[PDB]
Structures are given as structure tokens and as C-alpha cells.
């Protein structure tokens, strides 16, 4: 489930029951903001209570395709320990956008874009 809200993308990531899910999912995700203009991207892993070793290089990759694409992506829902995992495996997490939840994830592309 991929939407737009004002020219942005929305994602929210849900517990999964296969590894083939999410490689549908980013290929469908980085095909859509590839595809037509958008104004940035956001995603949110709250649903995630432990993030797989498979999740975690998908947002590798998202974060490192959607830099390269100039496109705004600010992760979202991020509990204090998943943010430990996911910085281990090797996503900056300070050196990106991130916020508590969609609604702070919407505004704070929003404000980045009036600058």
C-alpha cells in the first residue's frame, strides 16, 4: 500500500509473513517515485517490533536510492531499541530525517520545503 498525500508518499510498513513481501514491496515503492514527480517520502516502521535483517538493507537502500533521486525521505515510528539495530546494521540514523509519527514525518518535509 503505496499513497500520496499532497504530492508526498506514504508508507507504513506492517509485520510481514514472508521475505518475498518486502522485495514486492520495494520494488514497487522505488518504481512509483521513480515514475512520476513527488515531493518527498515517508515511512513508517511502528508496526515493526524487531527489524529484520532483510527490512533493515531494504531501508538501506530506499534511503540510499531516494538521496541519489533528490527526494525527501524521513523515517518514521522508530521505538529506541529498533533504532540501535538499525544503526548497527549500518543506517545512519542521526544523519537523517526521522520523527515520532506520520503526522511529524508529513510536517517535517513540509517545513524543510519552504526554506
Known amino acids: 500500500p503505496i499513497l500520496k498525500v499532497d504530492d508526498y508518499w506514504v508508507v507504513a510498513i506492517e509485520e510481514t509473513l514472508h521475505d518475498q513481501s518486502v522485495i514486492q514491496f520495494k520494488e514497487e ?5 521513480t ?3 513527488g515531493k518527498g517520502l515517508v ?3 511502528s508496526a515493526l517490533e524487531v527489524v529484520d ?3 533493515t538493507r531494504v531501508l538501506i537502500e ?3 536510492l531516494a538521496e541519489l533521486l533528490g527526494l525527501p525521505f ?3 515510528g522508530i521505538k529506541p531499541a529498533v533504532a540501535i539495530t538499525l544503526t548497527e546494521m549500518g543506517l545512519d540514523l542521526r544523519g537523517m530525517a526521522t520523527a515520532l509519527n506520520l503526522q511529524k514525518g508529513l510536517d517535517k518535509l513540509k517545513n524543510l520545503a519552504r526554506m
Request: hydrophobic residues 60%.
Open 29 to 33: 515503492l522505488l518504481h512509483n517515485i
Open 35 to 37: 515514475g512520476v514527480a
Open 43 to 45: 515511512i513508517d516502521i
Open 53 to 55: 535483517s532483510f527490512v
Open 62 to 64: 530506499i534511503s540510499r
Open 74 to 76: 524521513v523515517l518514521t
